[PDB]
Symmetry: C4
Subunit: 352 residues, 4 copies
């Protein structure tokens, strides 16, 4: 009998061909939708629907109270990071709540200390707890999700992540998650794929997680690796209901951390929460910087405008229809035709 | 049952593998054709045949009256852009017509204002109306094409675009289009693929559109992404009847806009019509520059010479036979062998 | 009958599709393992188990006595290079042995002189002889392995390499090898693939060699091409039992050769043993430099920490379970998402 | 019925997947061959066997009399270029012949003038006429080959080229060619692939041509695109009997043209014969420069040493056995592992 053409005799050793955002384009389809008439609302969780299907990452260079307020006012939501004392994270929940009953989420880990944190976040009025771990396919993480759902699930929605497989998503669904957050390896500041050799290209990860979550009515949050507004449309078309953004929002005025003026231009610090600086285990993230991008409201407007254009091209009046769109797979040469090419760009563009 | 190897359980979610120009080469075949004896004529529309199968883009940095005159004199045609008052666009049609009864086209949009524009262009003597939209697979665009064909179709040919699928091309055929223009995403200055995440690699887009248009006897115009004279031959071999060029013609003396002398070299402005500067929706194009390339006549001579060489290699005495040629698909390493490699180029080449 | 789509009529002419480390990621799986509880021990040979599944290359810029001592103290092993007099190589074996009964290996070639070298290494107390050749699939190399096993195999373990195919691995198993070392072409300083045109991508090479060695109970050493700690996890998941490292260890304080201070930074010499400088046949290696990386102990800690993270993600409590993990194959775009992207890295990372 | 996944309904429109040298590696196999004992002799034509399976390109920056003499003395052969008067090309044939009865070839075109040239080359003592054209799959080229074979074929061997398909190779075999030269598009200075859009990746081109020529006993010359000594082994393994080199030999002392000292280093002019400068049709080649590489004899020694290493790895005692070797196909990531990587090269290598 002939070997598997990539080696050995086990056809399941190399189990899948993983596609990322740059591997696919959305195909145009028959459409009565124009960007103005598209409806961008979508479920964050079973019970919570957002006007704009975007949430900010639970990172100490992305989301504290000002980002959470701005995201909610723009129609999305912030997830407050957990790299700070319990009392301060709960205080920031209260700061968001005092700004008009805006929606807010907050991350917690797993274990006794994370439980105390979760309880004080609930008492502070948080709408969404995000059980936020590097590898959610673990009974301790599943136990955390289910125990939160058991004890405070009437009052608060409970998200679990992160996963990158159908079986891991199914495990979180069975534990009672109100949403499943997908992404192991794809983040712009993540080094898991080189440090551990572990990951899953995000379009395939979403397609697999959605195969478990969609039939259970559980929304999927696509988390990490989105670098363009078009990636939002691709993630939702692969079946996610919202996207979580770190890099694309770290450059905004509302993101915490230093505004850096270096060699005539403007940047802001952006670092993985598994980086050496954030943990102060070998690090699984880097510390870096992103270009300054101005007010959050303006960035969100550009991102949602790109999503609306995709809905016009695909004939999607709603995100639920966009989730039914088809991809074409592209080659490395198609990636060059898919970006502007063979021209020296001379003027600034707001979305490129 | 086993999942689709790229994810999920739907084998049609990723519907196609899209090839662009750089993914294929034309195979040599038995030939009695030399470049001198090839016949490059081809249908622009059902009724209009061009000596040279090339048209200039309807862009305000590519085609006003001087480009339209020069293109017609070279055996092709210009499509006058519509980013100017109706009276001025109609005036430029008259300027071309007063230069010897040369062929000319002009772009219009969709709606009442575009209708008034179309009527004055017809009164000015235009030969071809191009209903020119980002996404033609829309009943309003189809209605525009059919109503123009109904009211003025005896006097003028009516082109509709742009499309990137078989179903969208078929819809324009059924609406009565005299030609179908193909290209969503491929243009050198286009950012639709990153802003919206939408597009289709152009060789596959042409092959699919031709599968609908060729059996209906409707010519296909391949529009966008052509960067070399060899790309003209590839587009026609995939079944298109003409190619529309923006970047390759924007650098010519006849293209409107500024001749820029920067750091000792010469450039000209070239910008998407969906760029911020041209619209003055989030932009779907960039503003940039291309190297100055001299007189249009000389550029067209180089492009048609490359097409003639392809016809010699493929044994194609006519464009209709070139449309029957075969491709070989290449890998990323083949792309390096397909360009000149491992040599420092020391002398200027007119076509490279 | 139709040709093979890549050419000719022989479907076995292009026999395999070879994957390297960058072509695959490890998939997360259900896990009760955290990095702290993983057990990284693994068989170097049939009889020798290491606490850390790492050995240093038998190269004159990687392993002399200080590297061998440090590797053994860290839980792995050094293989002393053979580009020096027999008496000196045997002396370095004694130096390692006098430092606490640490494990040590030493390379030998093939023939009468290599036999004398092997005998004096055994008399000096060496634990592992490595019959170390460019192409082990040769009866002279197989004879060397079997004769060593026959004469001194009670006292010392005998490794043979290098191979890159199932049939070559099977030949070494039949000759009596206590381990099989895999890698033809992949080394960072190797030029065999361009000089001879010969090689095999290392993930496929390991999968094929393991298909012969694993059913015979013979451990596989993955040798060459590992550039990140995640590559260690990938090699072991493909079925190898240990990894051999040149580049990743050449930058350490214990590696022999010059510490180079050039343009404000620190490097160390690193050269192929088939390079012109090491042989003083056309060369099959280059002479170069790698960044200085500090003490070996610290490098090994970072590499094993990355391996432990992979074991946590894959649910592997032991290396034997990690050998059962699954890959996802990635595209060239996935390689960019798999490295940190779209951020200017501003702070040093210990493992990236 | 479902479309072809790359577009349209014709499964033969994209007829093949073309591999180039960088797409494949030779697999190691069981071997009693070492580089010293390999036999590199091979048929140039039906009647002519060379000690070294290498010929120099018929280019005015590669082969005049000094290169032809040096190539013959090294065991290969030169093909004198035809971009000079008939009397001078015939004179250079005589110059080679007066240097010890060395073998020599000379290029001719097609038509009456090429016939006069061929007759005077035969009278001057040439051993091989090379009917040398951009596209040999043409009855005029086939007629030239057959008429030369009819009139002078007792005295001289007749080669025809260039082709890139099985059908074109078969046509030259039927015309009576004593060898078939393969390569449309691959040359380092060639721009046919971008100017005309025409070509065929060279490994697939050789495999297809060999499928026609080998069963007829007609040797195949692999011409163009070879950039490393390992590419020689790959071309012969794909079934070619000799390789023709332009770039790799243009940098030698014996190549005609200027030795250029620019910014402290040494180069020599190298230009396509379809470049503007050589023709003084749109050009299908560029004018450039290559690094100076010293005496031809030394370059040939390095190239043949790499070929001998490949024969050792593949177990090929003769070129006829090397023609039976197998490839592994590699990915873009394998191309990086196949070159030296992640090391700053600090010392010159003679073959890299
Ligand atoms: C604090 O944040 C993170 C810390 C890490 C640490 C560095 N690694 C780690 O926990 N590895 C691990 C543990 C158990 C099982 C398998 C591996 C890694 C990732 C993140 C992070 C943050 N958003 C996504 O991931
Ligand atoms: C003015 O020209 C263009 C404006 C645009 C604008 C920016 N986008 C847009 O209209 N989006 C859209 C609308 C409806 C449905 C789906 C999406 C985009 C492309 C072009 C253009 C010009 N040649 C080709 O495309
Ligand atoms: C001294 O070390 C090496 C010398 C060489 C020499 C340069 N090549 C060579 O022996 N070729 C060969 C011989 C027989 C059959 C086939 C080809 C090549 C590789 C290495 C080396 C060191 N770790 C791995 O490879
Ligand atoms: C003088 O040398 C060459 C001139 C050319 C010219 C520029 N092109 C040309 O002849 N095209 C052609 C003619 C007939 C049918 C199809 C196309 C192209 C290639 C070469 C050349 C030299 N070694 C290989 O190719
Ligand atoms: O250090 C880390 N290692 C791995 N992933 C991280 C780390 N820090 C944050 N993340 C993830 O990366 C996401 C942001 O990715 P980005 O939008 O591509 O920048 C976050 O929402 C987290 O899921
Ligand atoms: O801003 C824009 N966004 C997208 N496509 C554009 C825009 N402006 C012009 N185009 C298209 O791009 C084509 C030119 O592409 P090029 O020849 O590759 O430069 C035009 O003929 C239009 O179809
Ligand atoms: O000159 C050489 N040519 C080919 N391989 C070599 C040479 N020198 C050392 N090696 C191999 O390369 C390995 C190290 O590869 P690295 O870890 O990728 O730097 C060694 O363990 C040997 O197997
Ligand atoms: O201008 C040209 N256009 C296309 N091919 C050329 C031209 N000049 C020489 N060649 C081919 O290129 C080969 C050399 O390729 P190289 O070894 O890759 O530099 C020659 O032997 C010819 O077959």
């Amino acid at each position: 009998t002939d070997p598997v053409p990539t080696g050995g005799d086990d056809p399941h050793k190399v189990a899948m061909l993983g596609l990322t955002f740059d591997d696919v384009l959305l195909l145009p389809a028959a459409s009565d939708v124009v960007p103005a008439t598209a409806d961008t609302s979508s479920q964050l969780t079973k019970k919570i629907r957002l006007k704009v299907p975007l949430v900010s990452s639970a990172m100490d260079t992305v989301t504290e109270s000002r980002m959470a307020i701005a995201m909610a006012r723009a129609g999305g939501m912030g997830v407050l990071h957990r790299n700070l004392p319990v009392a301060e994270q709960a205080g920031q929940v209260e700061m968001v709540k005092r700004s008009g009953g805006l929606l807010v989420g907050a991350a917690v880990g797993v274990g006794g200390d994370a439980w105390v944190r979760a309880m004080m976040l609930v008492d502070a009025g948080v709408d969404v707890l995000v059980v936020d771990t590097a590898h959610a396919h673990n009974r301790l993480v599943l136990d955390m999700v289910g125990k939160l759902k058991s004890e405070v699930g009437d009052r608060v929605e409970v998200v679990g992540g992160n996963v990158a497989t159908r079986s891991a998503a199914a495990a979180l669904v069975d534990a009672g998650a109100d949403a499943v957050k997908v992404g192991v390896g794809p983040g712009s500041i993540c080094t898991t794929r080189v440090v551990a050799g572990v990951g899953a290209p995000q379009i395939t990860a979403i397609l697999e997680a959605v195969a478990a979550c969609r039939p259970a009515g559980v929304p999927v949050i696509a988390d990490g690796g989105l670098q363009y507004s078009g990636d939002i449309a691709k993630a939702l078309a692969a079946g996610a209901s919202t996207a979580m953004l770190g890099s694309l929002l770290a450059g905004t005025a509302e993101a915490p951390g230093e505004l850096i003026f270096v060699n005539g231009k403007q940047y802001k610090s952006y670092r993985g929460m598994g980086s050496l600086g954030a943990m102060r285990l070998v690090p699984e993230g880097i510390e870096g910087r992103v270009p300054f991008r101005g007010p959050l409201s303006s960035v969100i407007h550009q991102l949602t405008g790109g999503l609306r254009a995709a809905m016009g091209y695909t004939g999607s009046p709603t995100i639920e229809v966009l989730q039914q769109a088809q991809f074409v797979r592209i080659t490395p040469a198609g990636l060059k035709e898919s970006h502007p090419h063979d021209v020296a760009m001379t003027v600034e563009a707001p979305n490129y």
